[PDB]
Ligand binder design. Structure first.
Ligand code: HEM
Length: 188
């Protein structure tokens, strides 16, 4: 997992559960105190899993609930650390550019496996976004979407269209419907 992104999760976990829980969890995996992660750094997915397992143990909360809460709260963290991706954008534009952003931020990582997040308009007021990744981080995915709605102050309804798993890849397709129209038909 891209290091700086794990960095956002650490900050978000501190916001949710406190420095004691987080410090203890990072200590359990040998994380240097006040460790600063650099842009080219990659952090083992298993290390991330172990950090979250410790937070779960200490807070008594199920790991899936933690990922859901982290997703909901991490958008704020992203808006502070990566402000350029939010400036002058509407929620629909933000969501539609995510697939490209994830490809961009993982390009120079050995064995890059970013999640695919292809979104496609399906109506004047809705898009279908399909999460595809071997990591099966459904709760985090859904949480970020909810947090994005809150950050952009644009109400949406989210319905699952379908989910599945094949050859190690998990997929979750959701239909995101906006209160007001966001698209209009134009000649192709
Ligand atoms: C400006 C905001 C965002 C940035 C900069 C960003 C960046 C990233 C990056 C680089 C990773 C690491 C991937 C890897 O190392 O393979 C990641 C993970 C992830 N991102 Fe984002 N992300 C943002 C917003 C979102 C949003 C809005 C969604 C979903 C609607 C999303 C869904 C995910 C998921 C589910 C993962 C977890 C890894 C996986 O499932 O395979 N991200 N993000």
């Amino acid at each position: 997992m891209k290091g700086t992104i794990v960095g956002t999760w650490i900050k978000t976990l501190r916001d949710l559960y406190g420095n004691d829980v987080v410090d203890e969890s990072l200590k359990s995996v040998g994380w240097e105190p006040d460790r600063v992660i650099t842009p080219l750094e990659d952090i083992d997915d298993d290390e991330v899993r172990r950090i979250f397992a410790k937070v779960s143990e200490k807070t008594g909360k199920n790991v899936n609930e933690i990922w859901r809460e982290v997703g909901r709260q991490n958008i704020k963290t992203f808006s502070e650390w990566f402000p350029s991706y939010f400036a002058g954008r509407r929620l629909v534009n933000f969501l539609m550019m995510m697939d490209e952003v994830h490809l961009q931020l993982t390009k120079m990582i050995k064995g890059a496996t970013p999640p695919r997040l292809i979104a496609k308009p399906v109506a004047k007021d809705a898009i279908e976004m399909e999460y595809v990744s071997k990591r099966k981080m459904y709760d985090y995915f859904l949480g970020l979407i909810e947090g994005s709605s809150k950050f952009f102050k644009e109400e949406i309804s989210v319905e699952e269209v379908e989910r599945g798993e094949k050859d190690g890849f998990s997929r979750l397709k959701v239909r995101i419907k906006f209160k007001n129209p966001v698209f209009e038909y134009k000649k192709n």
